[PDB]
Amino acid sequence: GLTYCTHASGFSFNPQTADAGTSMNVVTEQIYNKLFDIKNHSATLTPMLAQSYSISADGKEILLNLRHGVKFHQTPWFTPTRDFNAEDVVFSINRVLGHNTYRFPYFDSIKLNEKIKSVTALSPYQVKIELFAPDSSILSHLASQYAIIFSQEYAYQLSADDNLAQLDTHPVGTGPYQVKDYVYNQYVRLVRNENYWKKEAKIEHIIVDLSTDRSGRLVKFFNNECQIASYPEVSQIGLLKNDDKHYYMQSTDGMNLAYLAFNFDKPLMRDHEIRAAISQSLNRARIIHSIYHNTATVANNIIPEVSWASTVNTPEFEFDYHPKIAKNKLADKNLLLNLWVINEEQVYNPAPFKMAEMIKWDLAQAGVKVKVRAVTRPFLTANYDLILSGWLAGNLDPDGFMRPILSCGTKNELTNLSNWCNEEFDQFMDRAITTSHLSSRAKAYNEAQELVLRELPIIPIANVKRILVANSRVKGVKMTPFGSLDFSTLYFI
RNA sequence: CCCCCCCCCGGGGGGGGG
RNA sequence: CCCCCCCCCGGGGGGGGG
Ligand code: HEM
Numbered sequence: 001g002l003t004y005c006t007h008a009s010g011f012s013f014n015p016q017t018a019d020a021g022t023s024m025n026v027v028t029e030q031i032y033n034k035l036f037d038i039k040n041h042s043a044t045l046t047p048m049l050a051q052s053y054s055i056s057a058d059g060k061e062i063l064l065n066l067r068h069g070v071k072f073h074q075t076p077w078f079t080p081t082r083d084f085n086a087e088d089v090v091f092s093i094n095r096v097l098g099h100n101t102y103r104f105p106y107f108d109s110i111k112l113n114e115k116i117k118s119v120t121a122l123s124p125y126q127v128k129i130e131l132f133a134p135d136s137s138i139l140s141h142l143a144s145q146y147a148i149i150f151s152q153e154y155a156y157q158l159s160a161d162d163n164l165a166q167l168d169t170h171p172v173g174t175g176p177y178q179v180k181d182y183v184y185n186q187y188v189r190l191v192r193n194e195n196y197w198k199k200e201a202k203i204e205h206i207i208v209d210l211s212t213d214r215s216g217r218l219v220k221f222f223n224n225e226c227q228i229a230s231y232p233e234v235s236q237i238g239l240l241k242n243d244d245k246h247y248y249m250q251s252t253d254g255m256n257l258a259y260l261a262f263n264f265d266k267p268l269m270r271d272h273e274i275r276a277a278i279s280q281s282l283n284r285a286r287i288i289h290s291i292y293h294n295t296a297t298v299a300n301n302i303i304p305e306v307s308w309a310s311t312v313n314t315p316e317f318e319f320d321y322h323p324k325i326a327k328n329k330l331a332d333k334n335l336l337l338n339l340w341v342i343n344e345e346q347v348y349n350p351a352p353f354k355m356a357e358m359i360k361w362d363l364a365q366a367g368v369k370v371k372v373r374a375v376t377r378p379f380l381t382a383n384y385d386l387i388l389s390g391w392l393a394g395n396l397d398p399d400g401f402m403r404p405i406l407s408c409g410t411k412n413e414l415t416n417l418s419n420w421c422n423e424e425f426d427q428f429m430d431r432a433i434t435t436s437h438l439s440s441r442a443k444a445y446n447e448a449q450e451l452v453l454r455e456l457p458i459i460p461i462a463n464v465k466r467i468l469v470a471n472s473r474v475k476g477v478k479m480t481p482f483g484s485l486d487f488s489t490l491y492f493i
Numbered sequence: 494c495c496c497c498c499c500c501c502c503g504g505g506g507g508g509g510g511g
Numbered sequence: 512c513c514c515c516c517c518c519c520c521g522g523g524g525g526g527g528g529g
Pocket of ligand 1 (some may be wrong): 245246472474493
């Protein structure tokens with residue numbers, strides 16, 4: 001038996017209804033399968049519930065050849081009568097599109113229904129996707145944590161009794177692990193799926209512990225009630241070592257960006273002169289040590305270096321810390337600005353309010369008055385001059401993170417906190433998915449990044465590392481920038 | 494119930510890359 | 512740790528014999 005301890009913050013049996021850029025769902029990574037997986041810095045489509053695919057010459061039609069003999073979980077709440085087929089695929093994508101099955105933040109922010117025309121079953125083992133125009137990002141989005149396949153047989157039985165809410169309370173998937181029992185925001189008890197379509201899970205029983213706070217997580221670990229500890233307290237990390245023979249640490253870089261956005265609804269914030277000066281006033285180097293204790297990189301980029309689309313070696317930032325230039329342009333302007341901070345646990349921010357004080361301090365030195373406000377996620381959904389946020393993405397295709405944050409389509413949404421719209425940026429972004437090749441795609445993505453780093457719609461603060469601690473007994477631990485953790489590969493020695 | 498071909502999975506052996 | 516070929520096992524589909 002293995003125990004995985006992590007935060008109750010962001011816990012869901014459905015990453016589709018969850019707010020985008022906030023989590024990597026460690027639970028749905030084990031109980032649900034996608035059509036494809038992408039687990040390499042080359043973005044190679046690993047076939048999962050889809051054996052293979054082919055794209056029409058014009059680029060507007062994708063055919064998915066689905067795997068045979070795949071069966072859904074046999075749980076107390078559901079007992080399947082048939083194998084996985086095209087009907088389960090058709091139901092799952094049509095739901096997020098808003099089409100006949102007979103708010104999805106991620107899929108809304110990438111505008112899937114504007115990408116996809118139709119998803120239809122040709123054979124029981126063949127699905128046809130119609131596209132409005134060629135999109136080289138479609139299968140990467142269907143390779144993401146958000147594109148899990150649900151049971152059509154289960155949803156038909158649930159819709160029979162108005163019970164379709166149960167889908168997210170009592171799950172049924174094709175994953176290597178199966179849900180046994182749980183208590184909300186406390187624990188999840190997983191059991192190995194015996195009739196899995198791939199190499200079977202090595203550990204029969206896994207418990208996902210959500211109960212303990214960030215501080216007492218390493219406490220529970222060293223008390224041996226916890227064999228893998230995820231997201232530990234940042235100050236506690238500097239107490240640990242890599243020499244120890246009873247525990248090891250594993251870090252990973254990726255798309256985990258903390259940033260500051262300018263509200264472009266504020267006539268002052270639409271001024272490039274003040275935006276470039278505010279950035280010059282911020283000592284982002286000093287923030288990385290006080291907030292992240294060497295578990296982050298000062299970010300002068302939006303696309304991480306682990307992305308296939310990082311062809312720029314992140315050049316020197318033209319609006320980096322210089323308080324003398326900042327003091328001149330801002331003090332004489334006599335500015336007072338409302339800085340909002342989302343009051344929640346952030347994966348890109350261990351201490352978001354502490355950082356908001358360090359920003360309030362750095363800006364006062366250059367003659368800017370900042371008034372920080374603790375704001376809730378739904379209150380924001382219902383005014384700020386600056387907001388402190390970020391993005392965590394496993395999908396390292398910049399269509400999945402740069403489009404939600406900076407595109408015109410998402411301006412009046414929670415994803416684009418800048419309320420920015422640049423038709424030249426949208427130009428590069430649209431171009432980057434009409435071309436199918438990585439050379440062509442990375443060129444347009446670096447052009448858009450270069451535009452973002454000069455127009456300054458956001459100030460990138462940190463390149464954050466996801467950390468975990470594991471016991472020496474536990475082998476088969478592989479932390480990747482591409483997703484959560486695969487519990488299938490875990491085993492004791 | 495017995496026998497071919499295709500696809501997929503798992504295992505073992507030979508070869509190739511860090 | 513990643514990738515070829517051979518062999519074996521299991522599963523799914525098409526074909527052939529009582
Ligand atoms: C490789 C170098 C290792 C050294 C030098 C080492 C040393 C020790 C020491 C000194 C203790 C007593 C507590 C202490 O004062 O540290 C201990 C206990 C223990 N060690 Fe190790 N250890 C090593 C590797 C491992 C590994 C790989 C495991 C995997 C299980 C392991 C499992 C344990 C366990 C479980 C205990 C507690 C008693 C027990 O469970 O049998 N050790 N070891």
